[PDB]
Amino acid sequence: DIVMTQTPLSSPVTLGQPASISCRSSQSLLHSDGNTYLSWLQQRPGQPPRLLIYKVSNRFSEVPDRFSGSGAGTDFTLKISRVEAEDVGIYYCMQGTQFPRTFGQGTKLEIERTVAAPSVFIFPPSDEQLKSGTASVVCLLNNFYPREAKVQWKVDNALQSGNSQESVTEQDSKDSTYSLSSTLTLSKADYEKHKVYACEVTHQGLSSPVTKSFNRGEC
């Protein structure tokens, strides 16, 4: 079974800067028919892989010429001349010289861009959910860079702990930012014995922490 091995990138790639991804096979990919069956696929977040380069160096239809491929035998390289926002994702090599078809483990390409502060929004629990006996309070951090961000929930200015969960999106393929949602979950009981619900956000693009808040049952 031919084993394909890729090299990880050591750091995100700045927009506009070149990138190179390398792939090696455990034996030559030169087929007896004269072809070398090494292809490159890119998988953007949530999407299926898409073919970029086939037979070492050929660009599949509609692939921009900033992508190129080179190599021979057991050593191959995908090169992006100038990395664009849409290039974020995971790049895979695959061999088709022998069965089973096999893939490299993937190389992740992350984009480095300028600092971007999050826009912050707080959402009270809906009245429909309160009827069910639980209150979800949601805090949204929208389009920020870099990924590192701290969200702290406060209820009547008391720091919350152990009752929230957060989720972060993958890097955006258009502006290279992240977004984050944090959900604070209380019973209707605990929710209705307090007034002020605050989400306080720390992040490199904020001069000082930003708080968004609401008062229960006010416009």
């Binding site: 929004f121 809906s126 979800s136 949204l140 949602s181 959900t183």
Partner: protein, 217 residues
């Protein structure tokens, strides 16, 4: 105009079988092998097998021989992948892909198959109501099992500024996710905003209108 469109997500208990469809359109089907490759959650790509629609011959990787069956139904121009004796390790996104001269040049969107004995549960959907700038609104999709759910906005007309977050697993063992969009505040009183939530395992289909909370007393 080559397309491959796969069936919706599945969930089955250990020991059961599943059958996934890949509907091909827009090319001469008998002239191209169709392959299947799977991808476990945060994992890489694993080749499974291939079928030639011309003569229905197949070839499988050793580890799937006797467990995976590929077939080609010419009148519905559809490839099927059936796999039996499912195991937890079979949870994965299953892709079909067309090959052209050995290279995989067109991929279906993938089908999530979850192998679990946990009970299926459909979500509840709650509004995240908007509060010359930008407004954020969304839908909370709470308490479902298994993955996945899909959220579109205005039946697919609204795509810019949408962020549908990765689901979080709650301590109850049920998932929850939010889907938000940012819009001009000036559109709030005039443009209607509807999140279309689908959870195929529980046959949940919900369209929720999301409007500013009225401050009317």
């Amino acid at each position: 105009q080559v397309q491959l469109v796969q069936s919706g997500a599945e969930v089955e208990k250990p020991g059961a079988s599943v059958k996934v469809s890949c509907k091909a359109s827009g090319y001469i089907f008998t002239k191209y092998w169709v392959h299947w490759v799977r991808q476990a959650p945060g994992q890489g790509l694993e080749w499974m097998g291939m079928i030639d629609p011309e003569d229905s011959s197949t070839r499988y990787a050793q580890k799937f021989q006797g467990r995976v069956t590929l077939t080609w139904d010419t009148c519905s121009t559809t490839v099927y992948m059936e796999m039996s004796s499912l195991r937890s390790e079979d949870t994965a996104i299953y892709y079909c892909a067309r090959a052209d001269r050995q290279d995989f040049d067109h991929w279906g969107q993938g089908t999530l198959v979850t192998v679990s004995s946990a009970s299926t549960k459909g979500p509840s959907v709650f509004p995240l109501a908007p509060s010359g700038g930008t407004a954020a609104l969304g839908c909370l999709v709470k308490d479902y099992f298994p993955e996945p759910v899909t959220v579109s906005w205005n039946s697919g007309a609204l795509t810019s500024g949408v962020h549908t977050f990765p689901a979080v697993l709650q301590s109850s063992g049920l998932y929850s996710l939010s889907s938000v969009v940012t819009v001009p505040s000036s559109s709030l009183g005039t443009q209607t905003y509807i999140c279309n939530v689908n959870h195929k395992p529980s046959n949940t289909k919900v369209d929720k209108k999301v409007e500013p909370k009225s401050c009317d007393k």
